[PDB]
A paper describes a structure:
We replaced DinF-BHD40 with asparagine, mimicking a constitutively protonated aspartate. This mutation abrogated the transport function, likely because the protein was trapped in a protonated state. We also soaked DinF-BHD40N crystals into low pH (∼4) solutions, and determined the structure to 3.0 Å resolution by combining molecular replacement and MIRAS phasing. The low pH-soaked structure of DinF-BHD40N is largely identical to the un-soaked one (root mean squared deviation (r.m.s.d.) <0.5 Å for 447 Cα positions), ascertaining that the protein was indeed locked into a protonated state. Tellingly, TM1 in DinF-BHD40N is no more bent than that of DinF-BH, suggesting the notion that TM1 is kinked in an extracellular-facing, protonated MATE transporter is not always applicable. The most functionally important difference involves the side chain of DinF-BHD40N, which participates in an H-bonding network also involving DinF-BHY36 (TM1), DinF-BHN180, DinF-BHD184 (TM5) and DinF-BHT202 (TM6). In this network, the side chain of DinF-BHD40N forms an H-bond with that of DinF-BHD184. By contrast, in the deprotonated DinF-BH9, no such interaction was observed between DinF-BHD40 and DinF-BHD184. Taken together, we suggest that H+ evokes substrate release by breaking the charge–charge interaction between the deprotonated DinF-BHD40 and the bound substrate, and by engaging the protonated DinF-BHD40 in an H-bonding interaction with DinF-BHD184. Our results suggested that the protonation of TM1 in DinF-BH induces the release of substrate without entailing significant structural changes in the extracellular-facing transporter, including the bending of TM1.
Author numbering: 3 to 448
The structure:
Amino acid sequence: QKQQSERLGTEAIPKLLRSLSIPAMIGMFVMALYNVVNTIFISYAVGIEGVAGVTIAFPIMMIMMSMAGALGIGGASVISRRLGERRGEEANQVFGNILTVILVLSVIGFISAFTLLGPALQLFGATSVTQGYATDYLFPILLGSIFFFFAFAANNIIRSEGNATFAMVTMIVPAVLNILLDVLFIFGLNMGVLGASIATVIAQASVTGLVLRYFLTGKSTLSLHWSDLRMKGSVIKEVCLVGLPAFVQQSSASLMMIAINSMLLRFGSDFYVGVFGLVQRIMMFVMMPMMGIMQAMQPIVGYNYGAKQYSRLRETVMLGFKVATIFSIGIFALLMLFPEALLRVFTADREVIQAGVSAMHILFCVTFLIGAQIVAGGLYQSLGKPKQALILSLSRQIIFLIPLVLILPHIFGLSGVWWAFPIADVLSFILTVVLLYRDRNVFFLK
């Protein structure tokens, strides 16, 4: 019991999602812009060498980010599950008693920066060139760790409450900055990776300075305390609880895409790593459309569970679903009528727009089904019972994906790329379907 500051708690619930989604739909899309408009520089004051440096260094970023993402997520499904179920002050506690574990790692990172940086880095396809870059990239980042962590937790929990809007602005803003911040060093100076890396710390600092405001200054949305608010609850236990499947999802994908970057450093030293980098943020970029919808419900389907209008949250979940789908099929179509013009950035041989696009062809006759497949995941999450969600990811990401590449690559070919995805994913979808007639309670409406 505290004071539920504006945002909502309202039951104006379709425009809830509507004007809870779009802020992700924007922020994300723009940080997706930054990603873009940043890298391309590093194809300039440096060529493609460091562009790999990054692409290898990359996963090691996500290593922490998964860790603070679990952290960030817990928060979001706790704090909403406790703002319908209105233990208002518990939230206050949580918030801070997370900031603990963060500041724990915001140090461990600092530590390993000075420690495990190289040790780990060198450990795979260490092209004497791209090596230094990744270091010169990674060294800053870890220093460095602190702002980074915070800002994602924060920009996650503020969704967990209601502020996808100021989220917008925890977002839009590093972006715009970073752009002009990089330009600054990378090009205008010549602090290449070396300093587009410090450009993006000065980014994640400058937000944090701001996030303190929207958490101290006119302590917006909610229960937000600062002196001894936190300590180290036995609540800690309770977010690692929510988060376990959260940091799995990444440390499933992340821990597997270091591999496919470095097994491809044994074949294509740098030519083929920059194009990994490339294929991602078109998955990711035109993931967003989905991704964003989910974070709407994240807290919506959060304080609605929380002993409130069970009635109207299914409304969320059916709608939730209902939308997604139309983007599932939307992307999917657009992802297989324009696999041509998107391989018109990949312009090379007339064989490149062949088995290059053959994978991209029916590799993704799956897409339209992916909608649910992921909606489901925030709705075992917006409702702290990720034990089934725990269950879930391990299918999609590992215990069905890997045990499919492997069973085509024993020997089945560049067919072992293709069938391995299309189909692994659909066993994952079929599976999910059953976890909801397992639980005729989320969607206890149709």
